[PDB]
Structures are given as C-alpha cells and as structure tokens.
Amino acid sequence: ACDYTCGSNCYSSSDVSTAQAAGYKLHEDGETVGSNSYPHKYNNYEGFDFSVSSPYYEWPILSSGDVYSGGSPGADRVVFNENNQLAGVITHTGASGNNFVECT
Ligand SMILES: Nc1nc2c(ncn2[C@@H]2O[C@H](CO)[C@@H](O)[C@H]2OP(=O)(O)O)c(=O)[nH]1
Ligand SMILES: [Ca+2]
C-alpha cells in the first residue's frame, strides 16, 4: 500500500524521506537545481492546514524513485520547513492549472 498516493503515483515514507533529505541539503547550502530553481519557497496559496510551521519549501519527488537532478519535475512535490520537518506531499495531478491538491 502507498503511504502517499499522488494521482497514480505511489510513494512510501522512505521515498519521501529520501527526496526531502536531498531538497533540504540544497536549501541549507543555498543552491538550486532545474529551470524552476528547486527547492524554492512554497507560498501555500492553497491554504493547506499543515501541522508544522512555515516557511515552507517545495522539492520534486519522482515516481522513478530517483532524486530530482534537473529536467521535468513531474507533478509531485514534498513540502518541508526550515527545521527539515515534513509538512506534506502535494501534487498538480487532479488540480486545475498550476494548483495543488494533497496526496492521499
Ligand atoms: N499552486 C501554487 N503554486 C505555487 C505556490 N508557491 C509556489 N508556487 C509555484 O508557482 C508556479 C505558478 O503559480 C507553480 O507552478 C508553482 O511551481 P511548481 O510547479 O514549481 O510547484 C503555492 O503556494 N501554490
Ligand atoms: Ca518507491
């Protein structure tokens, strides 16, 4: 079973932890990857009720199991905060335009 289901993509907690670790490291070093410059601030326009405090940052999580290194980020993202706490896993899949919905 999936710990997180983003549309058709299935993620385990280990997938999320691995992605989050990579994104947080880049954040701490002040570096980015990809044309969209990940990780970058997640403004939470959607208004999700995260259990952890902001600021929030988003980083792609890939269905391939590999850590994002550039190129197309796909539709899924892990959101973490300044303390490297997981806020949630969200996706553009099933959402209009560039909006996000939470993975289940
Ligand atoms: N929907 C949404 N997009 C955000 C938010 N913060 C940053 N963005 C980024 O701004 C772009 C245009 O709104 C979105 O595609 C998204 O980039 P990502 O695709 O990199 O997540 C947010 O809180 N909500
Ligand atoms: Ca996996």
From Swiss-Prot:
Its EC number is 4.6.1.24. GO terms for cellular component: cell septum; hyphal tip. The keyword Metal-binding does not apply. GO terms for molecular function: lyase activity; ribonuclease T1 activity; RNA binding; RNA endonuclease activity. Disulfide bonds join C2-C10, C6-C103. The active site is at H40, E58, H92. Keywords: Disulfide bond, Endonuclease, Hydrolase, Lyase, Nuclease, Signal. It is an enzyme of class 4 (lyase). The keyword Disulfide bond applies. It catalyses: [RNA] containing guanosine + H2O = an [RNA fragment]-3'-guanosine-3'-phosphate + a 5'-hydroxy-ribonucleotide-3'-[RNA fragment]. Belongs to the ribonuclease N1/T1 family. Monomer. This is Guanyl-specific ribonuclease T1. The lineage of its organism: Eukaryota, Fungi, Dikarya, Ascomycota, Pezizomycotina. The gene is rntA. The chain holds residues 27 to 130 of 130 of the full protein.
